[PDB]
């Protein structure tokens, strides 16, 4: 039998359907008392929401896979048991297991596959128009945010550099301090004068108001964008960009969204928390998430279900996940420093605060900063 009390943190607009999932959980586990709330600052900030006071934080919380190495090394999350590991590994696609594994051990329960795509108004742009960045932006406005390194760091990967080495596990393996890194910096700088590229802190609002024909966004907004665009909804994988005069696919990050168990819990509450985390990331629960938000399951069977297989967003995400089209976010503890330093590097190139004469110096300093 499973008993105990568990606090669950989810992202703000997810609460209504996690309440439905928790109702399903309580059919099987009637004696577990779950309190579902939004988190203080969302899954993109889980490591600090938990770290500021682990005993006060939720017992089960939503967290993106890049944060897991930091949280594991800090002792905020424990390895999954052998049986829990086997379930994750057997039920979900390979990259989901890679996403939650740190030094050979799993530290979270994966449930969704996240890659950004182009979302666009098909009354304004065609499927052919969105194949290239310059071609798209010559025909309509793309709204985006150059202060967000999750949006734009992958251009360095398109340029042929590595982030923490071949597989994201090599502390000294970022090699962006090179001519290839400079090519990415120059691409950011070019976009400042591209009249079809609109800098904004709220790209989705620009799509809603009609000021943008296209945005880059992820599947957490799939159902949201389908509602906004209605019969004009369309989606595509990322386009090619020109780097050093060559067309290359513009990458996104591949992220795995997860739930983790707070290591503070003990006794019955710990068992209840692990049971909840397993349940809310099971196939049925992943399909409920899909039905509400459009997020893409990592469960092998769910991905091949008719409804997911016919969804154009799922198809675009599956394309994005292929080698060359994205890179799995690394989960090194150093990712904290990476994210902090990457945003001003990219935005400085875009705004011109970093001129071309300084690209090499700034990239050298960046690599030193993130490679300790
Ligand atoms: O809008 C939808 C979301 O709304 C709600 O989110 C709001 C927050 O609740 C509210 O607090 C606020 O956030 C601001 C915050 O208050 C400020 O303090 C500041 O944040 C700084 C932060 O405090 C610092 O510690 C630091 O953060 C670093 C962080 O520690 C580190 O891990 C890393 O972050 C990177 C992630 O780890 C990485 O995974 C990736 O994040 C992706 C993510 O993977 C992907 O899923 C996607 O996230 C979606 C999410 O799935 C959706 O559910 C939806 O979330 C809503 C929230 O749940 C609500 O709480 O939308 C999300 C965004 O699309 O996209 C993420 C990328 O955007 O990359 C991360 C790096 O970008 O590095 C950071 C930076 O070093 O620095 C912070 C910045 O100063 O700023 C906050 C934002 O203004 O406002 C939120 C709404 O904007």
From TrEMBL:
<dbReference type="GO" id="GO:0015768">
    <property type="term" value="P:maltose transport"/>
</dbReference>
<protein>
    <submittedName>
        <fullName>MalE1</fullName>
    </submittedName>
</protein>
<comment type="similarity">
    <text>Belongs to the bacterial solute-binding protein 1 family.</text>
</comment>
<dbReference type="GO" id="GO:1901982">
    <property type="term" value="F:maltose binding"/>
</dbReference>
<dbReference type="InterPro" id="IPR006059">
    <property type="entry name" value="SBP"/>
</dbReference>
<dbReference type="Pfam" id="PF13416">
    <property type="entry name" value="SBP_bac_8"/>
</dbReference>
<dbReference type="GO" id="GO:0055052">
    <property type="term" value="C:ATP-binding cassette (ABC) transporter complex, substrate-binding subunit-containing"/>
</dbReference>
<keyword id="KW-0732">Signal</keyword>
<keyword id="KW-0813">Transport</keyword>
<dbReference type="GO" id="GO:0042956">
    <property type="term" value="P:maltodextrin transmembrane transport"/>
</dbReference>
